[PDB]
């Protein structure tokens, strides 16, 4: 049926979503999972939201990513309006009009990370690693745990993803190209890619490797 999580709300606001859920027999939970059908975001007047994990796992799963205005309006009009009509256009980083969630809902047959082996390497922040990994699998990539366990051959295309911020070492991520043969890039490659639901030419994200 319908199962919701919310992102960016206040308790007051959450309470309104709850009232909504009660009226319409919609399930409402704290954590996002496979079953989650909807992701309710705090947006501005033009449905521009912030980027949060739920936001990403939302698009990645092709869930409904809908502005909080879906709720209040539905309450205000004593009935449940169309998700179609309140969907989030974009975000405060990737643009007000990119229609990410849209694409997704209609691309579950060709996922942006078809034929990719991704290895999320090293420490991350604000986002547990297994979640970033879950993210990329939802997009069709294949997760790999250790640099040395990329699937050699040609069949596939490997990629190492790092978040430089969270490192406590001097010269050590400039030198991944020593222990494997994959392009290296920042998390922003994935997040950006998932936001837009477009595969971002590695170009802008590559990290330079000590020969």
């Amino acid at each position: 049926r319908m199962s919701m999580v919310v992102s960016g709300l206040t308790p007051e606001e959450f309470m309104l979503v709850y009232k909504f859920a009660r009226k319409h027999h919609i399930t409402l939970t704290n954590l996002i999972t496979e079953e989650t059908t909807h992701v309710v975001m705090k947006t501005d007047a033009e449905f521009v939201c912030e980027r949060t994990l739920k936001y990403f796992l939302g698009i990645a799963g092709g869930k409904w990513v809908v502005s909080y205005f879906w709720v209040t309006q539905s309450i205000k009009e004593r009935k449940m309006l169309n998700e179609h009509d309140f969907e989030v256009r974009g975000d405060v980083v990737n643009g007000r009009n990119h229609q990410g969630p849209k694409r997704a809902r209609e691309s579950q047959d060709r996922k942006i990370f078809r034929g990719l082996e991704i290895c999320c390497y090293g420490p991350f922040t604000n986002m547990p690693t297994d979640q970033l990994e879950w993210m990329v699998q939802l997009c069709g990539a294949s997760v790999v745990k250790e640099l040395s366990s990329f699937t050699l051959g040609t069949g596939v295309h490997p990629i190492v993803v790092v978040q430089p911020d969270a490192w406590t070492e001097d010269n050590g991520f400039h030198a991944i190209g020593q222990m494997c043969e994959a392009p290296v890039v920042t998390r922003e490659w994935v997040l950006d890619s998932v936001a837009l639901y477009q595969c971002q030419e590695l170009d802008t994200y590559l990290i330079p490797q000590i020969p």
């Binding site: 912030e50 980027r51 949060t52 980083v93 986002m127």
Partner: peptide
């Protein structure tokens, strides 16, 4: 939630 953290934002990015």
């Amino acid at each position: 939630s953290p934002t990015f």
